[PDB]
From Swiss-Prot, chain E:
Ubiquitous. Expressed in heart, brain, placenta, liver, skeletal muscle, kidney and pancreas. Expressed at lower level in adult lung. Expressed in fetal brain, lung, liver and kidney. It comes from Homo sapiens. It comes from the Eukaryota. Essential component of the NELF complex, a complex that negatively regulates the elongation of transcription by RNA polymerase II. The NELF complex, which acts via an association with the DSIF complex and causes transcriptional pausing, is counteracted by the P-TEFb kinase complex. (Microbial infection) The NELF complex is involved in HIV-1 latency possibly involving recruitment of PCF11 to paused RNA polymerase II. Residues 89-187 form the HDAg domain. The NELF complex is composed of NELFA, NELFB, NELFCD (isoform NELF-C or isoform NELF-D) and NELFE; NELFA and NELFCD form a stable subcomplex that binds to the N-terminus of NELFB. In vitro, the NELFA:NELFCD subcomplex binds to ssDNA and ssRNA in a sequence- and structure-dependent manner. Interacts with the RNA polymerase II complex when it is not phosphorylated by P-TEFb. It is found in: Nucleus. This is Negative elongation factor A. Residues 125-187 are annotated as: NELF-C/D-binding. The modification Phosphothreonine is found at T157. Belongs to the NELF-A family. The HDAg-like domain is essential for transcriptional repression, and mediates the interaction with the RNA polymerase II complex.
Swiss-Prot record, chain F:
GO terms for biological process: negative regulation of transcription elongation by RNA polymerase II. Widely expressed. Expressed in heart, brain, lung, placenta, liver, skeletal and cardiac muscle, adrenal, thyroid, kidney and pancreas. GO terms for molecular function: RNA binding. It comes from Homo sapiens (Human). It comes from the Eukaryota. The chain holds residues 154 to 582 of 590 of the full protein. This is Negative elongation factor C/D.
Length: 85, 48, 192, 149, 187, 429, 96
């Protein structure tokens, strides 16, 4: 139920806030990403081995992980009747 | 994570939960004593 | 500034009186624990008569442990819920938990209702001795109190065996704290 | 006069869900003439009420019989005549919501106005022809007095 | 609220109560009945239609007793003046409602030069006397007990007994089986 | 067709004289019945009164079996106008003044009142003013307020408790309005509805005094009051209400207290309370999934209800009809068949206890309606003729012969045996 | 019978809606469906993907090197994204 003056003010505010939201040249986003990844790492921990060991496996690309696995989705009607799966 | 890192904690949090209940009533003396601590107060006492 | 000065008028504390049930919730908790013990005894009896159908994808020992853990967790959750229902509006644990300032409902449950079941490496207490966990027990006992289920509450005090099992469960936290610091810093160093 | 609403109610019920708070009670009330229903919080510690009690409710937009407006600031040392002299219980709140049975085509017939008295809420519900002075974001008073009859 | 004049009062009454489709008195009669309108009816009642008088009489009862107490004289006066019209309907309703301002209840007098009333009363009384036993109990009787029903209408009357049963129904078998199950599970 | 067209034309334009002319000529030709008369009888005094007389006489001719048919149209014409409603109530209540034979009169008056209420039209206060409410203004106020709102408020409940507990109780019949007792039952028995715990005992006491207490009256004057069923009745109602509103307990715990349950179910009001409580619980589409017995205890409670009282047999039949007619698509057909067989057992039990004719008619309607499996009616009729014994009345034989006339029974129940139910029944005729 | 490196296979019905099949209906809702899925314990991703009546679209492999070698560089980038998101948002913590 907005009025014309309210709508004009709303458009001005939206444009101002969006222009404020742009990134700033010179920001060291690499260090920000590194810290935003590392800081949460200090509070977490069939088998999937989640947590810091999984982070090490992903970071250090290891030709053999601890628990490799595949999730397979059945294509035809076999996805419905376990007998034909 | 686009969220605050500083929040109200400890006794301040507990007492602000207790403070804003529906049945917290203050006489004028305590209201003046509390308003003495607002740095941004405009000097007008609200209607009770 | 405002709240810390209204608190001088209101005040806030915690004490023994804030960790007491009404002597009618105690009976409910005792009945729940008795029923849990009866259920685990029944499962053990049905196990030793080979009347236990293995759970899909689980061995016989695995499914036995699964039913045992399910019963014990049900007992702990029910006793904790009863303890929460028992608390008054003037209790201090409840006031400090509902505001999120400190603690959580599990802490209230462990202080009032029951400490719960101890674990190491995600499993019950292992047979450190030959086919038993302590010299005070008997060979090949898989009952609740012989594998680390702390029946009492922090208020009511722990019996010797439960105290030792609690110490075992506690040591794991210290070890994890020791290793997590050593790993996370290196990870972040390599990232940066 | 600035008298938005005035009618007689009786306490047909007390807080049904239970005593949530020590010093506050939830009153369910029904009117007599307009056949209104009311949901109110009162400071039960200083203005005790009982089941079956009757009171005169006078929701006024101002406390001055002449009809002038007020800044809304506490000025206890005031001399002008006030409606509060003939009433026992007075609140001062701010209506925050006005519901109704509105459709996409025709107007509403049964309205519902909610006003919050510094935390103590109140819902006034009835027919559209009475709740005309209620407009959102406006300060009002309560001015209720028990009727011993 | 003004003493709007006689013919104008009749026009207002026939505007608020003139809906012939709405044969029921509106709930608005709680606020529509005031001192001025009732007082002005003392002369414009002749200008009201029979339906208007009937609906006004029906709506007179839908008032709070505080209003009735503070409008004793006006209500009795309007009843008396409505008891002097050509319509027998308004006469009877005024006589029935004369008791409302005094006791809050309604008078019950009948058998007075009303052929339909007398004939209906007589035929229904004799018909009930034919089949006192064959009386359909009110809806409250299914809650009442044996003594209450006996005091109200007398002893329970059995229906027609079609035949006899040589084999017990499955209801008793289920009752005994569930009693055994409850005894076993409880103990 | 042209008569209806002429009616529409006449209603369309009031200004044309031809339309009134044609209406008058239609009346002259003998087709004035086509002219509207549903709202005309309200404006007519004598014609409406005489048609009311004939309708009520026909109602009393056939008892309930013809009242159920003559009641809709009669109630429509009576309650279409409020003035006719009020005069009908006044005359009918004056008829009810006599203490002998007044039960049917009060029932018909209550039927008119409830039909008027169904249209959203309220006259409860006038109904109270018609009776003896004058001597008790406070009770009149409380009943009027509750029946106007349609809800129970604790304040007026407490006022009535104070009045009735005092040494001068009012006529108990005034608080026995079907709507008012229905309000008590709904508030005290409906799952999901909450009532104050501090007034629960007062509600129970008021209901018990309303139902079980018996008062002696002569010439509209009180004589004595029976209070035999006041303490035990209140205790039974309290226990049953505790069972009803403490729903989180499983049905097994309900069965575990079967001695007390069956002891307390013998009260007819409590029997209706558990009847409707079970009705509302099983009315949930997902309740059947939670009901894990091929012969559930709920139908056993219904059997006990039917055994205890015959007044509830119409209500038991109605609930059984609702249960059987409800076709479920979220259950396996195997459990549907089990439930239908158990419901057939319940219908057999109801037919056994003397409530036969409506049950027989409903069973025949289901057999002819194809909404019931052939094997279901096979089992029903076979077990009925198994448990029942000759001689059979002319009414039962007449109503049961077309049931065996259907081929679904003639080709199934007729089997080669020395005691064949269909063959023996046919030979009995 | 079978292929090597696959020690064991679990037939599993998903409970969370993440692995559940999602198809927009005719009228426009989402209407999550539940279908059988399998979890191996080794990595082939090539013989497995080429099997008859096995969906070649949604069959991920949880192994970074295998995903890279089978499906390129952008696929391994997306897989790394999803793996990191899972290992981070497992405990409820959220990272931009």
């Amino acid at each position: 139920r907005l009025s014309g003056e309210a709508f004009d003010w709303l458009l001005g505010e939206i444009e101002s806030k969006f222009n404020q939201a742009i990134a700033h040249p010179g920001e060291m986003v690499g260090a920000l990403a590194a810290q935003s990844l590392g800081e949460p790492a200090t509070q977490m921990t069939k088998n999937v081995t989640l947590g810091v060991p999984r982070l090490k496996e992903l970071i250090n690309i290891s030709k053999k992980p601890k628990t490799p696995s595949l999730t397979v989705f059945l294509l035809g009607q076999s996805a419905r009747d376990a007998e034909r799966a | 994570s686009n969220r605050p890192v500083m929040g109200i904690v400890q006794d301040t949090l507990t007492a602000v939960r207790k403070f804003t209940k529906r049945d917290v009533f203050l006489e004028r003396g305590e209201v003046m004593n509390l308003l003495m601590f607002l740095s941004t107060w405009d000097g007008k006492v609200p209607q009770p | 500034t405002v709240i810390n000065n209204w608190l001088l008028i209101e005040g806030h504390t915690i004490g023994i009186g804030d960790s007491i049930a009404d002597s009618k919730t105690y009976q409910d908790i005792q009945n729940t624990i008795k029923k849990a013990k009866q259920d685990v005894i029944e499962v053990i009896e049905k196990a030793h008569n080979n009347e236990l159908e293995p759970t899909p994808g689980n061995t016989l020992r695995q499914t036995f442990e699964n039913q045992v853990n399910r019963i014990l967790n049900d007992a702990r959750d029910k006793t904790g819920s009863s303890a929460q229902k028992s608390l008054s509006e003037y209790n201090n644990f409840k006031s400090m938990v509902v505001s999120g300032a400190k603690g959580s409902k599990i802490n209230i449950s462990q202080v009032i209702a029951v400490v719960g079941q101890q674990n190491v490496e995600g499993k019950r207490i292992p047979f450190g001795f030959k086919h038993r966990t302590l010299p005070h027990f008997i060979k090949d006992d898989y009952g609740p109190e012989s594998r680390g289920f702390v029946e009492n509450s922090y208020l009511a005090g722990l019996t010797p065996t439960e105290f030792f099992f609690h110490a075992m469960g506690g040591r794991e936290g210290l070890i994890d704290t020791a290793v997590k610091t050593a790993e996370t810093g290196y990870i972040q160093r390599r990232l940066i | 006069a600035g008298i938005l609403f005035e009618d007689i109610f009786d306490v047909k019920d007390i807080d049904p869900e239970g005593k949530k708070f020590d010093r506050v009670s939830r009153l369910h009330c029904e009117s007599e003439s307009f056949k209104m229903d009311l949901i109110l919080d009162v400071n039960i510690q200083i203005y005790p009420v009982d089941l079956g009690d009757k009171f005169r409710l006078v929701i006024a937009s101002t406390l001055y019989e002449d009809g002038t407006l007020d800044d809304g600031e506490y000025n206890p040392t005031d001399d002008r005549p006030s409606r509060a002299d003939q009433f026992e219980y007075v609140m001062y709140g701010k209506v925050y919501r006005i519901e109704g049975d509105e459709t996409s085509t025709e107007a509403a017939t049964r309205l519902s106005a909610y006003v919050s008295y510094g935390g103590l809420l109140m819902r006034l519900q009835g027919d559209a022809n009475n709740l005309h002075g209620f407009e959102v974001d406006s300060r009002v008073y309560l001015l209720m007095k028990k009727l011993a009859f | 609220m003004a003493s709007m004049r006689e013919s104008d009062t009749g026009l207002w009454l026939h505007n608020k109560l003139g809906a012939t489709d709405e044969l029921w008195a509106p709930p608005s009669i709680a606020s529509l009945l005031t001192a001025a309108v009732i007082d002005n009816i003392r002369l414009c009642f002749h200008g009201l239609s029979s339906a208007v008088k009937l609906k006004l009489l029906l709506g007179t009862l839908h008032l709070p007793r505080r209003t009735v107490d503070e409008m004793k004289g006006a209500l009795m006066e309007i009843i008396q003046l409505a008891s002097l019209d050509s319509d027998p309907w308004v006469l009877m309703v005024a006589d029935i409602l004369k008791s409302f301002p005094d006791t809050g209840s309604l008078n019950l007098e009948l058998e007075e030069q009303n052929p339909n009333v007398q004939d209906i009363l007589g035929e229904l009384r004799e018909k009930v006397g034919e089949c006192e036993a064959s009386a359909m109990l009110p809806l409250e009787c299914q809650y009442l007990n044996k003594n209450a029903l006996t005091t109200l209408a007398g002893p329970l009357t059995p229906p027609v007994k079609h035949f006899q049963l040589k084999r017990k129904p499955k209801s008793a078998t289920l009752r005994a089986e569930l009693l055994q199950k409850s005894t076993e599970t409880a103990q | 067709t042209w008569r209806d067209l002429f009616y529409k034309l006449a209603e369309a334009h009031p200004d044309c004289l031809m339309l009134n002319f044609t209406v008058k000529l239609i009346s002259d030709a003998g087709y004035q019945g086509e002219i509207t008369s549903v709202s005309t009888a309200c404006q007519q005094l004598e014609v409406f009164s005489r048609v009311l007389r004939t309708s009520l006489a026909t109602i009393l001719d056939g008892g309930e079996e013809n009242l159920e048919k003559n009641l809709p149209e009669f109630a429509k014409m009576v309650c279409h106008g409020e003035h006719t409603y009020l005069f009908a109530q006044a005359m009918m209540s004056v008829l009810a003044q006599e203490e002998q034979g007044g039960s049917a009169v009060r029932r018909i008056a209550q039927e008119v009142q409830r039909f008027a209420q169904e249209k959203g039209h309220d006259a409860s206060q006038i109904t109270l003013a018609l009776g003896t409410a004058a001597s008790y203004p406070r009770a009149c106020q409380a009943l009027g307020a509750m029946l106007s709102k349609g809800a129970l408020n604790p304040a007026d409940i407490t006022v009535l408790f104070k009045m009735f507990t005092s040494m001068d109780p009012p006529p108990v019949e005034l608080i026995r309005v079907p709507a008012f007792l229905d309000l008590f039952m709904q508030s005290l028995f409906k799952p999901g509805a909450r009532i104050n715990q501090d007034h629960k005992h007062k509600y129970i006491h008021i209901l018990a005094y309303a139902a079980s207490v018996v008062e002696t009256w002569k010439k509209n004057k009180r004589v004595s009051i029976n209070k035999d069923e006041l303490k035990s009745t209140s205790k039974a109602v309290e226990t049953v209400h505790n069972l009803c509103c403490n729903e989180n307990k499983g049905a097994s715990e309900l069965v575990a207290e079967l001695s007390t349950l069956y002891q307390c179910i013998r009260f007819p009001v409590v029997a209706m309370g558990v009847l409707k409580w079970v009705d509302w619980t099983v009315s949930e589409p997902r309740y059947f999934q939670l009901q894990t017995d091929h012969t559930p205890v709920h139908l056993a409670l219904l059997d006990e209800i039917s055994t205890c009282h015959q007044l509830l047999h119409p209500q038991v039949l109605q609930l059984l009809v609702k249960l059987f007619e409800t076709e479920h698509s979220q259950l396996d057909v195997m459990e549907q068949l089990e439930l239908k067989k158990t419901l057939l057992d319940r219908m057999v039990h109801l037919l056994s206890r003397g409530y036969v004719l409506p049950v027989v008619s409903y069973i025949r309607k289901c057999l002819e309606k194809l909404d019931t499996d052939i094997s279901l009616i096979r089992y029903f009729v076979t077990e009925v003729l198994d448990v029942i014994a000759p001689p059979y009345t002319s009414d039962f034989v007449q109503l049961f012969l077309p049931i065996l006339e259907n081929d679904s029974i003639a080709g199934t129940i007729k089997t080669e045996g020395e005691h064949d139910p269909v063959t023996e029944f046919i030979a009995h005729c | 019978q079978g292929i090597e490196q696959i020690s064991k296979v679990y037939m599993h019905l998903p409970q969370t809606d993440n692995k559940k099949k999602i198809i927009i209906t005719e009228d426009g809702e989402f209407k999550a469906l539940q279908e059988w899925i399998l979890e191996t314990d080794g990595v082939s991703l090539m013989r497995v993907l080429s099997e008859k009546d096995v969906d070649p679209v949604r069959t991920t492999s949880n192994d970074i090197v295998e995903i890279f070698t089978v499906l390129g560089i952008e696929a391994v980038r997306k897989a790394l994204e999803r793996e990191l998101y899972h290992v981070i948002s497992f405990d409820g913590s959220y990272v931009n």
